[PDB]
Amino acid sequence: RPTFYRQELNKTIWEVPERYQNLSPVGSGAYGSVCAAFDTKTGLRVAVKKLSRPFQSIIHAKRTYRELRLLKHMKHENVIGLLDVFTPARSLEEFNDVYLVTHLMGADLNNIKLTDDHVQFLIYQILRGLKYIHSADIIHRDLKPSNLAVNEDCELKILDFGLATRWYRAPEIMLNWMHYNQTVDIWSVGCIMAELLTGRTLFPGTDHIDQLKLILRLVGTPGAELLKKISSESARNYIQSLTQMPKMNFANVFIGANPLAVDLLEKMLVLDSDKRITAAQALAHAYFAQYHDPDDEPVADPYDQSFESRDLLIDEWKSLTYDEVISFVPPPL
Numbered sequence: 001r002p003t004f005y006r007q008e009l010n011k012t013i014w015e016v017p018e019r020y021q022n023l024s025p026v027g028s029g030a031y032g033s034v035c036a037a038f039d040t041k042t043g044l045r046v047a048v049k050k051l052s053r054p055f056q057s058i059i060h061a062k063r064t065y066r067e068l069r070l071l072k073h074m075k076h077e078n079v080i081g082l083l084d085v086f087t088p089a090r091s092l093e094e095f096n097d098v099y100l101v102t103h104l105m106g107a108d109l110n111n112i113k114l115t116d117d118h119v120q121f122l123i124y125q126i127l128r129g130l131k132y133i134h135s136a137d138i139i140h141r142d143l144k145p146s147n148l149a150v151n152e153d154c155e156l157k158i159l160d161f162g163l164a165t166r167w168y169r170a171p172e173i174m175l176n177w178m179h180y181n182q183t184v185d186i187w188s189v190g191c192i193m194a195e196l197l198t199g200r201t202l203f204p205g206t207d208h209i210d211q212l213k214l215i216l217r218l219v220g221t222p223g224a225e226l227l228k229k230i231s232s233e234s235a236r237n238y239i240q241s242l243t244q245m246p247k248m249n250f251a252n253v254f255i256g257a258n259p260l261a262v263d264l265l266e267k268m269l270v271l272d273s274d275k276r277i278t279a280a281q282a283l284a285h286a287y288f289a290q291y292h293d294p295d296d297e298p299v300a301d302p303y304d305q306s307f308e309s310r311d312l313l314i315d316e317w318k319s320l321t322y323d324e325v326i327s328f329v330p331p332p333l
């Protein structure tokens with residue numbers, strides 16, 4: 001076992017191995033807290049996340065397990081992965097804190113306007129990561145700029161997969177459709193790409209209602225083919241009761257942008273999710289001709305999510321998480 005040292009940073013106790021030095025607070029979301037640090041063993045800059053109250057309830061315990069399982073499975077250059085995972089606890093009985101470690105990323109996409117060349121590379125990387133994620137039957141569901149880490153080199157990694165946000169959400173979701181597919185993520189990517197090209201949020205709704213109205217203004221109210229797939233009687237009334245609007249001409253709305261970028265946007269921002277382009281198909285779009293390499297856009301190993309339907313005690317989830325910490329084997333340097 002390694003030697004741990006303790007310190008207090010921002011009213012948070014940090015107890016980690018000696019190998020990680022010079023902890024410095026980066027930010028504190030609700031998920032947990034993060035510090036940048038230096039890993040003496042590898043000479044690398046890393047980010048260490050300390051989970052907040054990981055076993056405070058069934059919800060939290062299952063969430064802690066879900067995140068650890070998912071992070072241990074993601075091995076892709078465009079998806080945040082695990083360099084290490086540890087606990088100061090020496091037994092299950094004492095186990096109450098979880099620490100996750102990954103490569104330190106200097107910024108996010110919100111912190112940029114961009115050349116068409118930079119938009120191509122950044123969206124390319126997002127899709128390449130999504131292809132991998134989607135291949136494992138995982139859906140991100142909350143893609144947005146702040147979930148995309150980027151370094152000075154413009155290398156990008158997707159954070160918080162399968163774990164206003166409303167601005168990047170697919171319409172089927174705030175219609176409360178409970179059978180949405182993986183292309184909910186493609187809608188988000190389309191919102192992101194548009195914003196990188198124009199420098200403006202595409203659909204800055206103030207609430208769920210307004211958000212839908214901004215969306216239909218651009219892509220038009222639903223056609224009869226899409227109307228037939230809506231079961232909710234409520235949803236139909238609301239939708240059919242709206243002032244029917246036509247799909248706008250994207251070449252006009254995004255006038256000045258690379259026509260190839262416009263073509264892709266049109267394929268991503270389709271109201272009917274069954275017609276949206278997939279990540280794999282998007283990667284082969286002529287817009288990414290300079291980066292697309294079919295032999296270097298890998299898929300993931302099968303991912304076992306059966307635990308999602310289990311109803312267990314906090315201690316059972318806690319125990320399962322303990323097991324995942326112990327069985328962890330770091331990736332080759």
Ligand SMILES: Clc1cc(-c2ccncc2)c(-c2ccc3ccccc3c2)nn1
Pocket residue numbers: 026034047048049071080081082100101102103104105106146149159
């Ligand atoms: Cl908004 C945000 C940023 C980071 C982060 C910041 C800087 N560099 C890398 C990540 C992590 C974060 C920080 C540390 C992590 C460690 C292991 C697994 C995931 C992790 C996620 N979460 N959320």
Ligand SMILES: Fc1ccc(-c2n[nH]cc2-c2ccncc2)cc1
Pocket residue numbers: 171172175176177221222226229230231232235239271272273274
């Ligand atoms: F106004 C809209 C906006 C989006 C949709 C939609 N797109 N893909 C799936 C749906 C959908 C929404 C609600 N119920 C079934 C299907 C349907 C109507």
Ligand SMILES: [Zn+2]
Pocket residue numbers: 153
């Ligand atoms: Zn480089």
